[PDB]
Enzyme design. Structure first.
Site, mmCIF file in Angstrom:
data_model
loop_
_atom_site.group_PDB
_atom_site.id
_atom_site.type_symbol
_atom_site.label_atom_id
_atom_site.label_comp_id
_atom_site.label_asym_id
_atom_site.label_seq_id
_atom_site.Cartn_x
_atom_site.Cartn_y
_atom_site.Cartn_z
ATOM 1 C CE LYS A 191 -0.348 13.273 7.442
ATOM 2 N NZ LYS A 191 -0.598 14.275 8.428
ATOM 3 C CB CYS A 233 -5.291 12.638 14.224
ATOM 4 S SG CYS A 233 -5.246 13.868 12.819
HETATM 5 C C1 LIG Z 1 1.815 20.160 8.925
HETATM 6 C C2 LIG Z 1 1.552 19.451 10.252
HETATM 7 C C3 LIG Z 1 0.920 18.162 9.949
HETATM 8 C C4 LIG Z 1 1.038 17.173 11.320
HETATM 9 N N1 LIG Z 1 0.811 15.958 11.192
HETATM 10 C C5 LIG Z 1 0.938 14.898 12.034
HETATM 11 C C6 LIG Z 1 0.283 13.722 11.803
HETATM 12 O O1 LIG Z 1 0.301 13.127 10.701
HETATM 13 N N2 LIG Z 1 0.575 12.588 12.818
HETATM 14 C C7 LIG Z 1 0.921 13.266 14.321
HETATM 15 O O2 LIG Z 1 1.290 12.297 14.968
HETATM 16 N N3 LIG Z 1 1.423 14.495 14.278
HETATM 17 C C8 LIG Z 1 1.247 15.221 13.332
HETATM 18 N N4 LIG Z 1 1.709 16.654 13.459
HETATM 19 C C9 LIG Z 1 2.022 17.212 14.768
HETATM 20 C C10 LIG Z 1 3.481 17.270 15.078
HETATM 21 O O3 LIG Z 1 4.066 15.701 14.843
HETATM 22 C C11 LIG Z 1 3.828 17.834 16.299
HETATM 23 O O4 LIG Z 1 3.426 16.967 17.463
HETATM 24 C C12 LIG Z 1 3.545 19.333 16.578
HETATM 25 O O5 LIG Z 1 3.707 19.933 14.981
HETATM 26 C C13 LIG Z 1 4.211 19.965 17.485
HETATM 27 O O6 LIG Z 1 5.617 20.064 17.213
HETATM 28 P P1 LIG Z 1 6.166 21.469 16.597
HETATM 29 O O7 LIG Z 1 5.906 22.383 17.690
HETATM 30 O O8 LIG Z 1 7.763 21.275 16.531
HETATM 31 O O9 LIG Z 1 5.465 21.894 15.353
HETATM 32 C C14 LIG Z 1 1.566 17.575 12.379
HETATM 33 C C15 LIG Z 1 2.037 18.807 12.560
HETATM 34 C C16 LIG Z 1 1.836 19.800 11.320
HETATM 35 C C17 LIG Z 1 2.820 21.018 11.312
#
Ligand SMILES: Cc1cc2nc3c(=O)[nH]c(=O)nc-3n(C[C@H](O)[C@H](O)[C@H](O)COP(=O)(O)O)c2cc1C
Ligand SMILES: Cc1cc2nc3c(=O)[nH]c(=O)nc-3n(C[C@H](O)[C@H](O)[C@H](O)COP(=O)(O)O)c2cc1C
Ligand SMILES: O=C(O)c1cc(O)cc(O)c1
Ligand SMILES: [Mg+2]
Ligand SMILES: [Mg+2]
Lengths: 311, 311
Positions: free
Chosen positions: A43, A130
């Site tokens: 995280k 972020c």
């Molecule tokens: C629950 C939630 C929390 C996330 N927190 C972070 C974060 O802590 N730092 C980060 O770089 N990306 C964070 N992401 C972004 C994801 O790392 C990723 O880039 C994004 O969800 C797209 O991928 P996906 O389509 O498979 O969800 C978060 C995504 C979600 C769903």
């Protein structure tokens, strides 16, 4: 079949969790260690522990997800101590990844200095994207501030460093960012973070579905794959080969994985689909990718890595 | 039930085509006149007739569409002559809309001067967001160039004018754009144009599906509704009330329309879904919206226009 080389390390397969998903606590991280994921990442952390935004702050959607988490995390010292203790055990193939998302430039520099000074021998991901913290405007959309930050970082940080980027939607933006990034000894670019500041509405209640920021949240899942793939591809043709790519966005099936690898991604991260399904996803998606490879007569990722055909 | 007032004109209902879809020729336009669409807009024009990009350049997708059309159109003078003849007939409730998308600032100013000088009594849409012209960025991502263009425009253009905007993904971008736009006597903002420069891949052929720009194209349809709603809502809470909003993106059902109106859109434009279904869409969606209204006991759009509830 899926053996991968990335940042001069060997991984059994390219699959990881996306930062923020299933990686908040030690127990989450050990579940990822135990899964078939080729690697895993923490995280995103800040210097201090953060509760994050009020609930509800994450909702599952038919076509992906929406969230405004607000960077809830147990703090830098907690993740740093977990990764230090775990590299001494020599209990996994390939290093752990460590995400940081400082609320300011100074906070990022401070964490990067503690990582440099420590014995940490794995990989660091600097989150410049972020989109869920009310008052910090995605730094990687500010090309001047992004260049200034990175120049300072590389006067002292010698350890393997990647940057998590938000999506870009304009070819000139890719050119500007690539000229910035290519001047540094960066290990990688991770495209993409969430599509920022989307809205989902419950039409019966006539209401948004998350509490923070009047319901505006980062979008993930199938909604974003076209953008994700484009970002991976556009950086693949612009970045110097020393900077490899982690592809993130819309990955749920082996076919999605296959498409990211065809674009030029070397590692792949799974956010939303891992949130919904839990760590058993890795076994499923490995097997889907392998079957696609078997039907095509491919025995290694190098057979199609980066080989997306134009018309 | 759907009676709407926009730009000081009366329309039977808020529905329109989105520019670029079903509006290339006179025949297209007359088909839209004949349909239940409350109003209609022409294909974005340039000073010269354009063939557009090589084919294939539009593909239907399960979750919407991808295109890199390249602004094919029959030229400014063709559309201007058509609309001039048409307003003389007094054969429709409410004015026609006329889109322009000059390849440069000078071309936009030249077309706006021809409109000003003409007897055109309808509404003009300045497209500051075409993402499919090779070598030519989205201007509305260039806040200095957007302000400088609009200041020139409003030294002479006194007729009703809206701007078609690409999607923004950062709250600070909304604030910057709203301060720019609020200084002008704009009739409206139309959010959004396509999600720019996404990619779709056929995994079997290991290939992109459109020929121009190595397969990179504007994304429309269900993929983009969260972004499109967000942009409609974010401008609704930031624009001075003299500037109204047209909502465009992901509208296929009455429920999608309802969601846009709840965010604050006054007119609604349908792109991808109209491309797939043809002008019969307007009858269907009008009835879907009315049934949603009947279930809720709403007799006019003003019973929920702009009334999206936060948590
Ligand atoms: C629950 C939630 C929390 C996330 N927190 C972070 C974060 O802590 N730092 C980060 O770089 N990306 C964070 N992401 C972004 C994801 O790392 C990723 O880039 C994004 O969800 C797209 O991928 P996906 O389509 O498979 O969800 C978060 C995504 C979600 C769903
Ligand atoms: C075939 C195609 C051509 C388009 N041409 C234009 C154009 O000429 N001018 C413009 O402002 N938008 C154009 N658009 C964008 C649409 O007006 C609209 O903003 C976009 O498709 C999103 O709405 P949708 O989700 O309903 O498709 C075009 C879209 C498509 C599908
Ligand atoms: O190339 C065109 O004609 C076109 C123009 C736009 O403004 C959006 C789009 O998706 C396509
Ligand atoms: Mg394991
Ligand atoms: Mg009619």
């Amino acid at each position: 079949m899926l053996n991968t080389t990335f940042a001069n390390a060997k991984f059994a397969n390219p699959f990881m969790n996306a930062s923020g998903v299933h990686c908040m606590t030690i127990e989450d991280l050990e579940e990822l260690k135990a899964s078939q994921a080729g690697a895993y990442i923490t995280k995103s952390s800040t210097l201090e522990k953060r509760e994050g935004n009020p609930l509800p702050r994450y909702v599952d959607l038919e076509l992906g997800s929406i969230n405004s988490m607000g960077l809830p995390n147990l703090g830098f010292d907690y993740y740093l101590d977990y990764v230090l203790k775990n590299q001494k055990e020599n209990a996994q193939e390939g290093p752990i990844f460590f995400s940081i998302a400082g609320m300011s430039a100074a906070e990022n520099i401070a964490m990067l200095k503690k990582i440099q000074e420590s014995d940490f021998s794995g990989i660091t991901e600097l989150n410049l994207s972020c989109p869920n913290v009310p008052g910090k405007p995605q730094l990687a959309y500010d090309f001047e501030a992004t260049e200034k930050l990175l120049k300072e970082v590389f006067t002292f940080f010698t350890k393997p460093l990647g940057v998590k980027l938000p999506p870009y939607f304009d070819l000139v933006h890719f050119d500007i960012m690539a000229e910035i990034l290519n001047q540094f000894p960066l290990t990688y670019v991770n495209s993409v973070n969430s599509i920022g500041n989307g809205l989902f509405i419950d039409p019966e209640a006539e209401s948004v579905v998350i509490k923070p920021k009047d319901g505006f949240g980062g979008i993930g899942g199938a909604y974003i794959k076209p953008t994700a793939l484009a970002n991976v591809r556009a950086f693949y043709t612009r970045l110097k080969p020393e900077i490899q790519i982690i592809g993130t966005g819309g990955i749920e099936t082996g076919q999605d994985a296959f498409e990211h690898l065809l674009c030029g991604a070397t590692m792949l991260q799974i956010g939303t689909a891992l949130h919904k399904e839990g760590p058993a996803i890795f076994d499923r998606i490995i097997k889907e990718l392998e079957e696609i490879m078997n039907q095509k007569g491919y025995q290694s990722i190098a057979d199609f890595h980066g080989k997306l055909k134009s018309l």
